[PDB]
Amino acid sequence: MAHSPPGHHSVTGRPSVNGLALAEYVIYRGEQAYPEYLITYQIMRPE
Amino acid sequence: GTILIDLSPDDKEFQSVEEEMQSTVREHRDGGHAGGIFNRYNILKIQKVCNKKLWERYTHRRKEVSEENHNHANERMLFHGSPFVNAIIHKGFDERHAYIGGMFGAGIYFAENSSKSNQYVYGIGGGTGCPVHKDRSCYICHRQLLFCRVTLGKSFLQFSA
Ligand SMILES: O=c1cc(-c2cccc(O)c2)oc2cc(O)ccc12
Numbered sequence: 001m002a003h004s005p006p007g008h009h010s011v012t013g014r015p016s017v018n019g020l021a022l023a024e025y026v027i028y029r030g031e032q033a034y035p036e037y038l039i040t041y042q043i044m045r046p047e
Numbered sequence: 048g049t050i051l052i053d054l055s056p057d058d059k060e061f062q063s064v065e066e067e068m069q070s071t072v073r074e075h076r077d078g079g080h081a082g083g084i085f086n087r088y089n090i091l092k093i094q095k096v097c098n099k100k101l102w103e104r105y106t107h108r109r110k111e112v113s114e115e116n117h118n119h120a121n122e123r124m125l126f127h128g129s130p131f132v133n134a135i136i137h138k139g140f141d142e143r144h145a146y147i148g149g150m151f152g153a154g155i156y157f158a159e160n161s162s163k164s165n166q167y168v169y170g171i172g173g174g175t176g177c178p179v180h181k182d183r184s185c186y187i188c189h190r191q192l193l194f195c196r197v198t199l200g201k202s203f204l205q206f207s208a
């Protein structure tokens with residue numbers, strides 16, 4: 001498991017081409033996330 | 048010591064979480080290859096994950112990052128989808144849950160788009176799809192995502208193509 005950019009705690013990937021894609025984030029310590037909700041779901045076939 | 052508490056769909060907490068899930072769906076450049084063809088979900092259940100050990104571990108680290116960054120933990124709620132969600136809720140995030148091949152390094156990935164995390168529920172690039180039908184667009188089998196509280200701190204800004 002890799003390391004944070006020196007002096008930072010995480011990385012943000014901001015898509016620059018698809019202007020509708022929201023951000024993605026990477027952390028490098030498991031202690032920096034807490035899994036609060038468990039969502040069970042199906043995808044729905046479009047009409 | 049994880050216990051899971053079902054939220055009732057009348058609960059304002061349930062609706063809020065469902066809204067953050069349904070409103071952050073988008074179209075994907077792969078035409079649905081990895082995650083399926085869809086515009087919305089049928090939410091079957093939402094459960095609050097309570098684990099004390101894990102929570103104290105989260106907030107102790109939160110306080111550290113906070114103090115290293117002008118008392119700003121930079122806390123978000125973000126999506127995470129993988130085949131290992133049952134381990135995560137019992138034992139916590141760790142190196143097993145990292146994406147070695149990832150664009151921004153070998154760490155734990157998270158999405159603002161629920162539909163992006165959905166692409167990883169059955170593995171990298173959808174793997175071989177649902178276990179019962181081998182179908183990446185299966186409309187029958189139950190899928191599972193996490194909505195997680197994440198400490199970002201000072202975050203390195205990396206624009207991506
Ligand atoms: O939720 C995700 C899970 C994972 C993932 C990938 C590999 C292994 C794994 O256990 C999770 O990758 C992502 C990548 C992204 O750019 C955005 C979200 C995810």
Ligand SMILES: [Zn+2]
Nearest residue numbers: 177180185188
């Ligand atoms: Zn299936």
